[PDB]
Design a protein around this ligand. Structure first.
Ligand SMILES: Nc1ncnc2c1ncn2[C@@H]1O[C@H](COP(=O)(O)OP(=O)(O)OP(=O)(O)O)[C@@H](O)[C@H]1O
Ligand SMILES: Nc1ncnc2c1ncn2[C@@H]1O[C@H](COP(=O)(O)OP(=O)(O)OP(=O)(O)O)[C@@H](O)[C@H]1O
Ligand SMILES: Nc1ncnc2c1ncn2[C@@H]1O[C@H](COP(=O)(O)OP(=O)(O)OP(=O)(O)O)[C@@H](O)[C@H]1O
Ligand SMILES: Nc1ncnc2c1ncn2[C@@H]1O[C@H](COP(=O)(O)OP(=O)(O)OP(=O)(O)O)[C@@H](O)[C@H]1O
Lengths: 278, 55, 353, 188, 74, 220, 51
């Protein structure tokens, strides 16, 4: 006999009945990148038919980039509140074993239980570990796991046509990614997280401050003024550092003191003494 | 003649492809094949043992 | 006389061979269990009636027969280096007072480290999420492993010791999966604290694409960073990190979330230098005349280490004078001179941020 | 064909000698010596074993890190084997045969005199210096324009009498995958 | 030079210790070695042949006692 | 009352039967300590420990047989014979070949009397090395922390190697030479376990002295 | 090359064409060995046209 299927081996699927953390109402910054995620994820997930009707083929390849700030995985945590489907959470490095022959069983299982649970979604976090060229036999086992990347790549041509999978992906540095993946036909979607702007500033200030006890003295406009001239960031965890300069006390309702003092706490690096070029 | 029908049985039917690592004057030669297999083989046949050389 | 026969009867029980370890992948039926050995091969076996079928579960460490290859006994978890991460010992406590400065850093890490453990209420009321991480860096000054060390032996509770050189692993960077399993046992003994000494090497940039080592190191770094990007609640685990240069650590570690706090050691002020000099003058027997402001005026810009080595230099120079109690004039001489030799060898102490 | 006839006809005695000492797989270095009879051993099989030796070997012939023959089933030490080395690089550097004798020198005399008495005289007549000792110097140095470098070396090859000498080219030291040329220079 | 022969026959004779055949070999090489005074060449260039050589070298083929010295007339 | 000698005969006969299981504690193996009791499904109590192998494999065994969990925390090298998967004897110590013994010095013949002009700096050296040996009681009287690292620099020569190794032969204490670039290795962080093994055999041979040169080669 | 039916090849190619083809060398003689096995053949330069 063979696997039932699909009885694994490893991973496994789910863990998403005890998860995700919080809904997409958390972050309000993007509103555009989340719309490309929308039309590129759950518009195809609900309709395979309307594409064949209109005559445009939707790709399963999704790639996100731009960090920091984070974004990225929070769109997956938010996707698990958006959608009811399959969820593959695998650290890009997690599967590297002592025997190279375990790789193909692992990833092959991933894909056959994915199409088993189809409509499905697969996510691998920062393949940049496995996306670099190498030769020597010691890492040549890892050359067999990038041969595994090409294996599951051929399988990612095998999901077509129609039902189904969603391959989403993100990385902290996309330079060393070998283009074979990103090149058209397999991963067709390049998403870039932008640095937060004045819209994203005010939206992130409102959404992080909505979860803390804040004083009526505290102004958001001055901090979409002076930090917006430079930052940048991570702005969320900087307001968290404001509530954490309130947690320096013994504090009741946080004041603009701990706010401004946290913006000068984290962080400003001034350039330059030599700036008199301009 | 009879030697062809003799040495083939000893070396037959299967035989591994090995790599000569280094030579000991006993006619025993330290050999290597996948993986990490060293050994002493003293044979007078087919050799040519001078021209073998390691590697 | 009879106790020996008790041991020999134990040998009769030793005629039973040790069983073979394995994991539970799934189970196809009650007489078909999809299992794997720790050595790689996968199998499907039935089992005896002494099991509880529900207790089995997937991803379970079990022991198999040598022939039937089936579960007789099982154990939940095991890890070799953990107890050795728990076996660190440090005196003090009192050394936490001995270090002198730096006060606001001391109390700061006391709050962000100790306070989420004892008082989650203060945080959960205001609406603020507790910081899960912190960073220390010398030697702009020094005292990193001292301070944090006396925090591990101070707060006690559960604490885990890590040197960056134990993640080397040679073949198959599964020291990565030792970070995974290590974090799982930090989820076992939680709340726990994590040391990280010399995080530059295990924090590198992979700036220039090259060789192999840098790549697999960066791979274990992907494991670290994605386990701080959870998908997991690290509230209950603490992490303390110390390195020479906060430069090569990459924006991923430099990003909050993963690394919330940033604290440094600085060169001790003549006040703190005064204090640490006080506590270093205690163990050494001295002559009736003592004046610390002499050494405080003379000693400038030393590390706290360089200052205690300056005190030891005073005493060990005073073994030549053979006096038991030693004047601070000999301390001014040897301390001053040899200290200034340390400052001639003090080349390139200026580090990034 | 006659030499190959007699060559293949010795396999009848060879197969009788093939039964014993064949078990020599594999070469293995010890790690520590637990007690007088017992030695813990590591073999490139990557399994490690504590065992005695074949009693024809004197137990005082073994040192730590000594590659030793084995009887694979008992794992006992068979015979101590001297060589622990070498990758073909060093024997590639191991040199033989002379050429380009002395008179091929182009008239350089003080040079050839000093660089001659510094190698031949201590090596040809060692007793002379031991009498007058003192000591002859460790090593020498040559350099200058290309003409003529490396040719007087060929002369040292010719006039070389008994003990061979090992030529080492400069580039074979440097290799990628750092730490290779170190093992190299050490083992040579 | 004769020093190298002196060192070879001097070092190889350290063995046995006697084993008097080593004090036989040290003179053996210098029979022809230090004999000299005759060049051969072949013997000979004119195409004759040495008569003592074939004769004597036929006997010690089963070399036993004094046949080797009879041949050692050479 | 004479039956005690009968049981003596059976314990010696069983000891002779132990000898056949003691030959030989062939395979070296690594340990993972555990003490477990398994209720059923009526009751089975005792201790059960985990074991690795020299061939990288892993087993689970009812506790040896011979010596108990008295030793140790998860160790290694425990001697176990082939298919037995039980450890007759727990053997030390550690490892490994070139790393175990980098240098074992009898003594170099030269001494400080062969050098001159260094009497001040060799007074500093003879201080730093000799005062922990004999004069430790003086430290405990004064409350002194002795020096450890002592830097040695200068263009050859100097001849600081004959200094350090000469007086190292005058110490009579255990001495290990070491070359700086030796710590450069073929795989990632071999030099780490190398140095840890070095300081482990040094702590075993305490007091001892380890001399390294060309630190700047590996200290860049 | 599609209408000519001669086999179509693009140049390096990463990373893994150094794997399949040859071991280590100038390597264009081994790629040229494949182009000799399959003839006629087209070699395209992919892409190395960039800013
Ligand atoms: N509106 C927001 N904009 C930007 N970042 C936010 C926002 N809300 C929360 N965050 C941050 O996102 C972090 C978690 O994001 P995630 O787990 O995706 O990290 P990541 O994207 O993998 O990291 P990085 O992209 O920096 O490598 C939290 O620590 C939080 O500080
Ligand atoms: N503030 C201080 N108080 C007391 N001792 C100190 C202080 N700073 C440094 N030291 C001394 O320095 C020695 C080393 O401890 P420390 O943790 O400073 O090393 P380190 O910071 O890793 O050194 P480096 O940064 O130079 O590698 C200790 O013996 C300690 O006594
Ligand atoms: N003084 C000389 N006497 C004899 N032969 C000479 C002399 N100078 C040059 N030659 C001949 O010229 C040729 C070239 O010199 P050679 O190549 O040995 O120097 P080189 O190897 O270039 O020196 P380097 O190793 O510094 O490059 C030699 O074959 C040698 O026979
Ligand atoms: N001041 C001195 N006193 C005694 N001997 C000396 C002195 N200076 C040089 N020598 C001699 O010079 C020779 C060369 O030693 P050298 O200077 O190379 O050692 P070193 O420099 O300590 O070693 P390294 O080169 O590894 O630092 C030695 O044999 C030593 O006897």
């Amino acid at each position: 006999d063979v696997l039932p299927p699909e009885a694994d081996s490893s991973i496994m699927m789910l863990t998403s009945d005890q998860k995700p953390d919080v809904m997409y109402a958390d972050i309000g910054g993007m509103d555009i990148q989340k719309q490309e995620v929308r039309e590129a994820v759950e518009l195809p997930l609900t309709h395979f038919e309307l594409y064949k009707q209109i005559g445009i083929d939707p790709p399963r390849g999704v790639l996100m980039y731009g960090p920091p700030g984070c974004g990225k995985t929070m769109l997956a945590k938010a996707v698990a509140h958006h959608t009811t489907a399959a969820f593959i959470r695998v650290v890009g490095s997690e599967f590297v074993q002592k025997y190279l022959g375990e790789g193909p069983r692992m990833v092959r299982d991933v894909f056959r239980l994915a199409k088993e649970n189809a409509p499905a979604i697969i996510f691998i976090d920062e393949i940049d570990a496995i996306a670099t060229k190498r030769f020597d036999a010691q890492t040549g086992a890892d050359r067999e796991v990038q041969r595994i990347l090409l294996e599951l790549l051929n399988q990612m041509d095998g999901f077509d046509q129609n039902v189904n999978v969603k391959v989403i992906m993100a990385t902290n540095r996309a330079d060393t990614l070998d283009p074979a993946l990103l090149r058209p036909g397999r991963l067709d979607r390049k998403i870039e997280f932008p640095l937060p702007d004045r819209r994203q500033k005010r939206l992130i200030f409102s959404t992080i401050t909505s979860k803390m006890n804040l004083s009526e003295e505290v102004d958001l406009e001055d901090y979409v003024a002076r930090p917006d001239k430079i930052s940048g960031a991570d702005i969320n965890s900087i307001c968290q550092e404001s509530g954490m300069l309130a947690v320096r006390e013994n504090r009741y309702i946080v004041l603009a003191k701990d706010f401004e003092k946290a913006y000068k706490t984290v962080i400003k690096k001034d350039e330059q003494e030599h700036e008199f070029y301009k | 003649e009879e030697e062809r029908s003799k040495v083939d049985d000893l070396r037959g039917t299967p035989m591994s492809v090995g790599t000569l690592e280094e030579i000991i004057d006993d006619n025993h030669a330290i050999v290597s094949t996948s993986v990490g297999s060293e050994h002493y083989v003293s044979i007078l046949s087919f050799v040519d043992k001078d021209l073998l050389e390691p590697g | 006389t009879k106790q020996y026969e008790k041991s020999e009867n134990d040998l009769k029980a030793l005629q039973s061979v040790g069983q073979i370890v394995g994991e539970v992948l799934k189970q196809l039926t009650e007489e078909k269990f999809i299992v794997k050995a720790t050595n790689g091969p996968r199998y499907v076996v039935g089992c005896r009636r002494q099991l509880d079928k529900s207790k089995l579960k997937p991803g379970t460490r079990v022991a198999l027969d040598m022939t039937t290859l089936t579960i007789m006994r099982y154990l939940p978890r095991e890890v070799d280096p953990l107890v050795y991460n728990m076996s660190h010992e440090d005196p003090g406590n009192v050394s936490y007072s001995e270090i002198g400065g730096l006060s606001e850093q001391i109390r700061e890490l006391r709050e962000v480290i100790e306070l989420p453990l004892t008082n989650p209420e203060l945080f959960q009321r205001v609406g603020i999420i507790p910081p899960k991480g912190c960073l220390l860096y010398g030697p702009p000054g020094t005292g990193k492993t001292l301070l944090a060390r006396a925090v591990a032996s101070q707060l006690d509770c559960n604490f885990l010791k890590v040197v960056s050189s134990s993640i080397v692993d040679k073949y198959i960077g599964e020291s990565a999966r030792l970070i995974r399993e290590m974090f799982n046992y930090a989820r076992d003994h939680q709340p726990c604290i994590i040391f990280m000494d010399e995080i530059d090497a295990i924090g590198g940039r992979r700036f220039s694409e090259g060789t192999s080592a840098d790549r697999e190191i960066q791979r274990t770094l992907m494991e670290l960073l994605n386990q701080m990007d959870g998908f997991d609640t690290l509230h209950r685990v603490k992490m303390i990190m110390a390195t020479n240069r906060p430069d090569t650590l990459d924006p991923a570690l430099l990003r909050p979330g993963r690394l919330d706090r940033k604290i440094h050691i600085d060169l001790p002020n003549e006040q703190a230098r005064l204090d640490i000099l006080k506590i270093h003058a205690g163990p050494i027997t001295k002559h009736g005349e003592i004046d610390y402001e002499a050494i405080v005026k003379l000693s400038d810009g030393f590390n706290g280490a360089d200052l205690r080595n300056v005190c030891t230099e005073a005493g060990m120079f005073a073994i030549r004078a053979d006096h038991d109690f030693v004047v601070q004039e000999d301390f001014m001489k040897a301390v001053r001179k040899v200290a200034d030799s340390k400052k001639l060898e003090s080349k390139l102490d200026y580090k990034p941020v | 064909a006659p030499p190959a006839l007699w060559d293949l006809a010795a396999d009848k005695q060879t197969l009788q000698s093939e039964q014993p000492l064949q078990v020599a797989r594999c070469t293995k270095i010890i790690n520590a010596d637990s007690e007088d009879p017992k030695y813990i051993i590591n073999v490139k099989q990557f399994a490690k074993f504590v065992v005695d030796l074949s009693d024809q070997v004197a137990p005082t012939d073994i040192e730590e890190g000594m590659r030793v023959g084995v009887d694979r089933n008992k794992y006992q030490i068979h015979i101590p084997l001297p060589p622990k080395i070498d990758p073909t690089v060093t024997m590639m550097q191991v040199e033989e045969k002379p050429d380009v004798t002395y008179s091929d020198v182009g008239g350089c005399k003080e040079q050839i005199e000093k660089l001659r008495e510094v190698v031949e005289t201590p090596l040809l007549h060692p007793e002379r210096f031991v009498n007058l000792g003192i000591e002859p110097p460790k090593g020498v140095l040559l350099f200058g324009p290309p003409g003529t470098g490396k040719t007087l070396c060929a002369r040292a090859v010719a006039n070389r009498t008994d003990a061979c000498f090992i030529r080492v080219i400069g580039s074979e030291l440097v290799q990628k995958y750092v730490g290779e040329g170190a093992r190299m220079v050490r083992e040579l | 030079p004769y020093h190298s022969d002196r060192q070879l026959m001097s070092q190889v004779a350290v063995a046995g210790l006697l084993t008097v055949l080593v004090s036989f070999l040290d003179v053996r090489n210098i029979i022809l070695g230090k004999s000299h005074y005759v060049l051969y060449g072949l013997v000979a260039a004119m195409q004759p042949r040495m008569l003592v050589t074939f004769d004597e070298e036929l006997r010690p083929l089963p070399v036993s006692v004094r046949v080797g010295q009879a041949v050692d007339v050479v | 009352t004479h039956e005690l000698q009968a049981m003596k005969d059976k314990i010696k006969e069983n000891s002779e039967k132990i000898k056949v299981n003691k030959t030989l504690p062939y395979l070296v193996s690594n340990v993972i300590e555990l003490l477990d009791v398994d209720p059923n499904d009526s009751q089975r109590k005792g201790k059960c420990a985990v074991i690795k192998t020299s061939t990288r494999q892993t087993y689970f065994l009812p506790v040896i047989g011979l010596v108990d969990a008295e030793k140790l925390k998860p160790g290694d090298l425990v001697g176990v014979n082939k298919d037995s998967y039980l450890i007759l004897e727990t053997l030390p110590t550690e490892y490994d070949s070139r790393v175990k013994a980098m240098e074992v010095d009898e003594r170099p013949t030269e001494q400080y009397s062969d050098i001159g002009g260094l009497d001040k700096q060799i007074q500093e050296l003879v201080e730093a090395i000799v005062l922990p040996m004999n004069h430790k009681e003086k430290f405990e009287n004064l409350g002194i922390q002795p020096p450890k690292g002592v830097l040695m620099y200068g263009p050859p020569g100097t001849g600081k190697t004959l200094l350090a190794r000469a007086c190292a032969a005058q110490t009579k204490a255990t001495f290990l030479k070491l070359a700086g670039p030796q710590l450069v290795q073929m795989f990632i962080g071999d030099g780490a376990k190398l140095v840890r093994d070095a300081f482990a055999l040094a702590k075993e041979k305490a007091p001892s002295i380890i001399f390294i040169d060309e630190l700047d080669a590996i200290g860049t | 090359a599609h209408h000519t039916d001669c086999t179509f090849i693009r140049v390096s190619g990463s990373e893994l064409v150094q794997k399949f083809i040859g071991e280590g060398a100038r390597m264009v003689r081994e790629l040229f060995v494949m182009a000799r096995e399959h003839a006629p053949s087209i070699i395209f330069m992919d892409e190395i046209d960039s800013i």
